[PDB]
Design a protein around this ligand. Sequence first.
Ligand SMILES: [Mg+2]
Ligand SMILES: [Mg+2]
Ligand SMILES: [Mg+2]
Ligand SMILES: [Mg+2]
Ligand SMILES: [Mg+2]
Ligand SMILES: [Mg+2]
Ligand SMILES: [Mg+2]
Ligand SMILES: [Mg+2]
Ligand SMILES: [Mg+2]
Ligand SMILES: [Mg+2]
Ligand SMILES: [Mg+2]
Ligand SMILES: [Mg+2]
Ligand SMILES: [Mg+2]
Ligand SMILES: [Mg+2]
Ligand SMILES: [Mg+2]
Ligand SMILES: [Mg+2]
Ligand SMILES: [Mg+2]
Ligand SMILES: [Mg+2]
Ligand SMILES: [Mg+2]
Ligand SMILES: [Mg+2]
Ligand SMILES: [Mg+2]
Ligand SMILES: [Mg+2]
Ligand SMILES: [Mg+2]
Ligand SMILES: [Mg+2]
Ligand SMILES: [Mg+2]
Ligand SMILES: [Mg+2]
Ligand SMILES: [Mg+2]
Ligand SMILES: [Mg+2]
Ligand SMILES: [Mg+2]
Ligand SMILES: [Mg+2]
Ligand SMILES: [Mg+2]
Ligand SMILES: [Mg+2]
Lengths: 130, 96, 157, 236
Amino acid sequence: MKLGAFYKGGDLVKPSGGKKGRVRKTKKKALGGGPPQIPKLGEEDIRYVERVRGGNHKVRLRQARYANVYIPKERRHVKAKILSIVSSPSNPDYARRNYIVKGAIIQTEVGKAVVTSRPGQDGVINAVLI
Amino acid sequence: ARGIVLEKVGVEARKPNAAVRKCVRVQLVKNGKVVTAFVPYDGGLNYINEHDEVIIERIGGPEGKSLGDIPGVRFKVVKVNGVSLWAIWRGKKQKP
Amino acid sequence: GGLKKPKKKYLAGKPKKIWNKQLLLEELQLMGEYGLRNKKELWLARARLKWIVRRARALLSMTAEERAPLEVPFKEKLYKMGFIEDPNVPLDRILSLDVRAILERRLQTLVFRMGLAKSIHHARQLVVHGHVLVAGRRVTSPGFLVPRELEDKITIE
Amino acid sequence: VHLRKSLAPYWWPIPRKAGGVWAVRPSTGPHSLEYSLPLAVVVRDVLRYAKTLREARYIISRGYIKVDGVVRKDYKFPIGLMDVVEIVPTGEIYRVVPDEAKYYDLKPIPSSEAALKPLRVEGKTAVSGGRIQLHFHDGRNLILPPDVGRQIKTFDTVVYDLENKAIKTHLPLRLGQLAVVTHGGNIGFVGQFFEVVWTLKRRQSVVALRKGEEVRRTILDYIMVIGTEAPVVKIS
RNA sequence: AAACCGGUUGAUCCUGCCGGACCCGACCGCUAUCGGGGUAGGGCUAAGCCAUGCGAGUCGCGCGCCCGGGGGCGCCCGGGAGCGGCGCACGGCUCAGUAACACGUGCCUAACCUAACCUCGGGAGGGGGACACCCCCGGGAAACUGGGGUCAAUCCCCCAUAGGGGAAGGGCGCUGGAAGGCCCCUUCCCCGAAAGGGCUGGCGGCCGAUCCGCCGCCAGUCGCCCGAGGGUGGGGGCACGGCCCAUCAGGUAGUUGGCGGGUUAAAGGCCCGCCAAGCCGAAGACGGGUAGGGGCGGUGAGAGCCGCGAGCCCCGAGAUGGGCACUGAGACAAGGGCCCAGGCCCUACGGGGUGCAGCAGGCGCGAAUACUCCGCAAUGCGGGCAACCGCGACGGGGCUACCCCGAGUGCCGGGCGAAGAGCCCGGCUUUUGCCCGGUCUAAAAAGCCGGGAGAAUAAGCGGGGGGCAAGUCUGGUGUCAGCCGCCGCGGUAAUACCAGCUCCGCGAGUGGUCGGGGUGUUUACUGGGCUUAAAGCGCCCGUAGCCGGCCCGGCAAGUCGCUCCUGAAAUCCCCGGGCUCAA
Ligand SMILES: [Mg+2]
Ligand SMILES: [Mg+2]
Ligand SMILES: [Mg+2]
Ligand SMILES: [Mg+2]
Ligand SMILES: [Mg+2]
Ligand SMILES: [Mg+2]
Ligand SMILES: [Mg+2]
Ligand SMILES: [Mg+2]
Ligand SMILES: [Mg+2]
Ligand SMILES: [Mg+2]
Ligand SMILES: [Mg+2]
Ligand SMILES: [Mg+2]
Ligand SMILES: [Mg+2]
Ligand SMILES: [Mg+2]
Ligand SMILES: [Mg+2]
Ligand SMILES: [Mg+2]
Ligand SMILES: [Mg+2]
Ligand SMILES: [Mg+2]
Ligand SMILES: [Mg+2]
Ligand SMILES: [Mg+2]
Ligand SMILES: [Mg+2]
Ligand SMILES: [Mg+2]
Ligand SMILES: [Mg+2]
Ligand SMILES: [Mg+2]
Ligand SMILES: [Mg+2]
Ligand SMILES: [Mg+2]
Ligand SMILES: [Mg+2]
Ligand SMILES: [Mg+2]
Ligand SMILES: [Mg+2]
Ligand SMILES: [Mg+2]
Ligand SMILES: [Mg+2]
Ligand SMILES: [Mg+2]
């Protein structure tokens, strides 16, 4: 979304560590961001198409069950099932709360897989077998 | 600026000159400061009364300070109750 | 932040010390000779003269190559106005011009010098009241600077 | 959207002080805003057929004016370089050609020439099916097969048939061709492309045209080849 | 005109300050006839409070219904309440915040989005639904709003296909300075179009006056959807440039950077998890003060100084203070929403509305200020196929000593008067003022042409001792009253005060106080001074900085020459032309 609660605009701090005044009192809607929308490991896949800036659309995986796991050693794509998240190297809190992010390790039925997609931005979990 | 006249005062001219230049004490509306304002013109003081609204204006002189023989006066009266003291003195207008 | 507004054009002719007795005498002489309304008219004429003289000075200060495409048209325009009588004089002679040459080009002055009026003030009254025709049209401004080609086309009603 | 008269382009043939505070804003069409003139401005200030914006809009709305083979009923339609303007009830045909004095002028052209437009190629893209889309100087596009698209390079010129939607001829950018300056300062000059300094950015290369002994310089972006020693279409 | 004048002495040469004379801006006093040109007017004062009115609509060629007139073919014309599309994020105001990528100049986005419009290529098949107006009932003080019934769509939704996105592998090929991009091939996952709708004409068929339609085809035309590019607007980044203070020297701890992620349309400590100690500073950090930036403006011969850097144009920010969102291509939205604060208005006490920094207008403040007027005719914009409609934008007048321009307040001869003013006499003219017509004007007003009587309707402000032009003329007062920017007068014989007469300067203006420039070579680059006039630190070491020997070779950074892309317009200088010249 474009939310003032998740403003991505500039700081008020200079590189010298000092403060600077606010050139603009209000927060631009163009500079607003949104909350995290990474999927939670669940019992069925739930997808939600959201309207974004300029009328485009973004598919959000609000809950993820299946992963498109690719085996390069077989050159094959299999739609596997996620038993669990083994680790989230970006932040362990994601794996602890059972959230799937890019670079996360997931134990699917084919084995361990690295998530090669942005599940909060792409709406699907493309994974590569390890 | 504007002011309200409080008392009529007379300052003594500087040493070589002998005279009692007649001024008033004026309290400015915007600040409340009380300052001595010279009332020019022969008989000009008689057109001034206590509690009369006056227009206070710089006396001239070098660098905005006091004038020739008047010690420590920086202002003078230009208007009395909305009518110019010059016009009142010349008879072109009557003080309201 | 500045907004441009028009300025007085007679400032270049107006002197900075008015209280000189010699300057007052010469200005009074010129004013009475040509029947001018006030000192502003004389100072406007002097401003015109100052423009002409400073243009001459500037063209003199420019190099020969730069001066070449401007020297002849400048003298031609002065001759056509009537301020200079010989359009082929040297440029430095233009520096010695006089305000009386500009004052002669006034419509009131020309009406008096053509013998159409009993006096210069009567010529001014004629131009004001509209009895002076310039090539068929009434020119009612006594301060109009008549050119050489239009000088002979002045009539009375 | 509004166009303040101060922000109107400087080459436009309109007074800068005497008039209203507004100018007719071109309606985002097939040219650049600063290198095009609206159709109402062409009708009122360039041809003097209409005395007001109301009369110009009436004339345009009737469909009397044709631009590049298509009737234009919008009074804000942009008109730009090399466009063919055709008046229907009178039969007069102009080309918007570069001009030394007015920077862009409507010069009458023959009826046989009215169906051709010399368009400078501005770029190429690869599109679906493996085809090549040529993008021209006025935003027009042409999709062609890859083999014909391979040999046409940027900054070339093509004489294009408006009525057939085809490339009548291709004029490649070579030294010694006749070129016209379509932009800045040295505008309208026609001469022989005889000298180039190839900068690292190809668009900013220094080009020199010659007309006998008349040598002018511009950048490569600002010239358009209009053929060899004789221009293909009447530009002057 | 590249200017000096008065003042410190018994007198003299200096220094040096203060005053005079000029221009501009603000306010103010006395006075004021006309016309033209111009983007003048609560800015310099509270972003202080507001009664009242107006200030964004348009489309029947998207849609159904109702009403009235007309007519027979398949409807014609007009109106109404609406749904629906597009617009209202442009335009108008103001100057609190801001010393900042705000602004200006020069470049980027290969890190991005964009309705409307343009072009090229392709597509438009099947099906379904609801809500207004309306009818029957209301409720409520009002605001607003409930239930049932019922007709539609270019309204809303599903299905199919096209298309799209993510991950991975490969490639001749494209663009481009350079591919993390485009195209092609391969695999999986995921998302997922459209209005053939309106009109016109033609054809055919179904149907009925209880209808005036529905359907199939064709052509024209305005439209709809996908892909690519452009256009326009917007988001973001970069280098450099433009204030004061050291009686402000250390500041910073998400602070500086890296790595991995989230979010975004998109890069980024934008945000998050871990890791390191980094980053700024005397070439002035940090702190404080002041201020919207620019084009530009005033002044001076110029260098320069100043901001009147108010009005006009461009960018920025804001809409009582502070926050947060909906819709939408675009807002966190001045005449839309929600909350806290702080006010206020209506009420039937249960509720509702509201903040003029929109155009008029009122209160307040202050030294200081315009009509609650007229029109969409010009300039443009939104809507519409169009015709047209709307617009306190804009245009027009009003008021106001806003700036510039051109004129009048008579001319001629004679007399008295002084050669002056003035009066009288004889003649002339009618700008101007007054009345009428045409033209002009959206209409008016004014302007211009023409007609009528008529000298007839029209001059003030400051000053006269020197500076500094103008009285040792007259009366009054008598160091009192008063003058006086400076020097200085007045204490009985005043050229200086109060009056008369008279003269002087400028003149529809002329004066007072302020601020800027000149003055001023008293800020000194051009271009000052430091023995004694103000001014060499008590002396020395040395960091940054500034300044630096000779010759030869290379470079070409400064420098110089030419050229190109630029530095918006207006403004400024020159030239030509058009307003009666002028402005
Ligand atoms: Mg003194
Ligand atoms: Mg002495
Ligand atoms: Mg205000
Ligand atoms: Mg239509
Ligand atoms: Mg209706
Ligand atoms: Mg705006
Ligand atoms: Mg639709
Ligand atoms: Mg693609
Ligand atoms: Mg679908
Ligand atoms: Mg349908
Ligand atoms: Mg990222
Ligand atoms: Mg930060
Ligand atoms: Mg000087
Ligand atoms: Mg204004
Ligand atoms: Mg607020
Ligand atoms: Mg709001
Ligand atoms: Mg308010
Ligand atoms: Mg108002
Ligand atoms: Mg109109
Ligand atoms: Mg005048
Ligand atoms: Mg006599
Ligand atoms: Mg009239
Ligand atoms: Mg007098
Ligand atoms: Mg006297
Ligand atoms: Mg004298
Ligand atoms: Mg005196
Ligand atoms: Mg000195
Ligand atoms: Mg000493
Ligand atoms: Mg010593
Ligand atoms: Mg010491
Ligand atoms: Mg000592
Ligand atoms: Mg060099």
